[PDB]
């Protein structure tokens, strides 16, 4: 060794290519590993040289040392990790490749590495390199990152800072090389669990890109994509150009894999939230029928049934094709099972959702007869009363069930036939006393159904007998706009 090391002239660049090849021999590589100065000579050199054949080689050696435990440790303790990182700057693709593969080694096995990479800027650099074109290279890099980001939030915030979400989202959108799409999907998912990073990932096109890969053959990917999309699915109610994603999901509902059927269902429930296009997209690719079919095929499995009903709940209201969707549910035999889900062993969350869906289906007049003829009413009341005591005297506040069941009855009360049942289960004395409730949301619905019930003379009498003019009128100046309006309508309807 001796001579080699020393030199500060045209002399040492010659010395350079000279050691890269002893690194190849086993007891030679092993040899230099047991030297303190042999390593720190490559290091100082590799960074402070400017001959593109001197670097390529010094880097090359380190890569060869990085396979063994005393190989790695000697590298690390030789302050090489600061160096290896500046080499991530080198234009020479032969060095980029030496460095990023090396570091990967370092992070995977060596102790105190992740810190050193971070502290030296590693992250902000590794994120800059995602514009490179070599897939074999990216997939390694997007791993180093996943390594540095796992269970470390400072790091995930710095990859947000750098424009990572864009970079990675571009990859998902450009390449098809699995090992890459995979390691890159893993990172996305890891950042998918951050307050901030979520919207970023979304706005960059995260949703639309992940879903090019749902019908992929590799399952170790379609997973990641599904899960990841599920996380983000609540940030993503704002986006456009989903036509693709929606239509795909609506087809994975057919998947004879329970754990993919739930994710398909979960994710839709969210992307159908509030966004009036997403609803229409979903309806036209036959989504109503797909959901119903999925609900029947799921039975007592409430991880599937809960989401799917929320989704049907969403699609049955507040968009141009909702009347379509309310009929669709009737025509594809959804009514009988929707109702049967108000029965045990359904749990309240699910029962909460299902009443909401029934509230909506009831707006469609065709669904008045059909819903009546499945005893949706007698059952809604059952729950209403059970619930209106669990309060007077969880998993969900019973107030929500009381409001839910009276709203649903409100809507159903529109049909004169229904109106007759409703009254004849001795409900009226119970509607009137809901007025006196601390919750306005409850007073609003209560007064609503009364208003409808009270379009019949004999009922207006019945409703007046309960002394309903006492609190309708003290609500007549209620803080709540909806509360106060209905009060007028019932009072107006008993005087005619």
């Amino acid at each position: 060794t001796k001579l080699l090391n020393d030199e500060d002239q045209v002399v040492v660049n010659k010395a350079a290519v000279m050691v890269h090849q002893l690194s190849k021999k086993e007891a030679s590589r092993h040899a230099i590993m047991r030297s303190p100065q042999m390593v720190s000579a490559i290091v100082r050199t590799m960074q402070n040289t400017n001959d593109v054949e001197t670097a390529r080689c010094t880097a090359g050696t380190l890569h060869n040392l990085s396979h063994h435990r005393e190989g790695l440790l000697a590298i690390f303790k030789s302050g090489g990790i600061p160096a290896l990182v500046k080499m991530l700057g080198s234009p020479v693709d032969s060095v980029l490749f030496y460095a990023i593969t090396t570091l990967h080694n370092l992070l995977l096995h060596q102790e105190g590495a992740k810190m050193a990479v971070r502290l030296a800027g590693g992250l902000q650099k590794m994120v800059a390199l995602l514009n490179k074109t070599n897939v074999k290279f990216l997939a390694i890099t997007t791993d180093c990152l996943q390594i540095l980001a796992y269970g470390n939030q400072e790091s995930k915030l710095i990859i947000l800072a750098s424009g990572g979400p864009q970079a990675l989202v571009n990859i998902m959108r450009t390449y098809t090389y699995e090992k890459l799409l995979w390691t890159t999907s893993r990172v996305l998912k890891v950042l998918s669990v951050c307050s901030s990073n979520k919207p970023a990932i979304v706005e960059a096109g995260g949703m639309q890109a992940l879903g090019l890969h749902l019908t992929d053959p590799s399952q170790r990917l379609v997973q990641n994509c599904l899960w990841t999309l599920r996380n983000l699915s609540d940030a993503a109610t704002k986006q456009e150009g989903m036509e693709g994603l929606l239509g795909t999901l609506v087809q994975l509902l057919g998947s004879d894999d329970i754990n993919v059927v739930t994710c398909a269902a979960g994710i839709l429930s969210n992307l159908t939230c509030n966004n009036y296009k997403n609803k229409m997209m979903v309806c036209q690719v036959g989504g109503i029928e797909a959901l119903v079919r999925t609900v029947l095929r799921a039975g007592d499995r409430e991880d599937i049934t809960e989401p799917a009903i929320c989704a049907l709940r969403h699609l049955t209201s507040r968009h141009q094709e909702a009347e379509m969707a309310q009929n669709a549910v009737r025509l594809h035999y959804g009514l009988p099972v929707v109702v049967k889900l108000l029965h045990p062993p359904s749990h309240w969350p699910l029962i909460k959702a299902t009443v909401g869906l029934i509230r909506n289906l009831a707006l469609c007049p065709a669904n008045h007869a059909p819903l009546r003829e499945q005893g949706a009413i007698p059952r809604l009341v059952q729950l209403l009363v059970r619930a209106h005591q669990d309060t007077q005297r969880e998993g969900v506040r019973m107030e929500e069930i009381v409001e839910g069941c009276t709203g649903a009855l409100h809507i159903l009360a529109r049909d004169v036939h229904n109106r007759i049942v409703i009254r004849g289960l001795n409900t009226i004395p119970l509607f009137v006393q809901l007025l006196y409730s601390p919750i306005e949301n409850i007073q609003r619905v209560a007064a609503g159904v009364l208003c409808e019930l009270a379009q019949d003379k004999e009922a207006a009498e019945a409703i007046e007998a309960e002394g309903a003019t006492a609190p309708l009128t003290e609500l007549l100046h209620s803080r709540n706009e909806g509360v106060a309006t209905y009060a007028a309508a019932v009072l107006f309807r008993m005087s005619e």
Partner: peptide, 28 residues
């Protein structure tokens, strides 16, 4: 339609050897 057009929908909140060596020959 419905009284309640301004209503919101509730959202559920949810929560390489082969290529490394291959790359140092495309380096050599």
């Amino acid at each position: 339609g419905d009284p309640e057009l301004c209503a919101t929908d509730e959202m559920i909140p949810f929560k390489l050897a082969d290529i490394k060596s291959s790359l140092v020959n495309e380096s050599e």
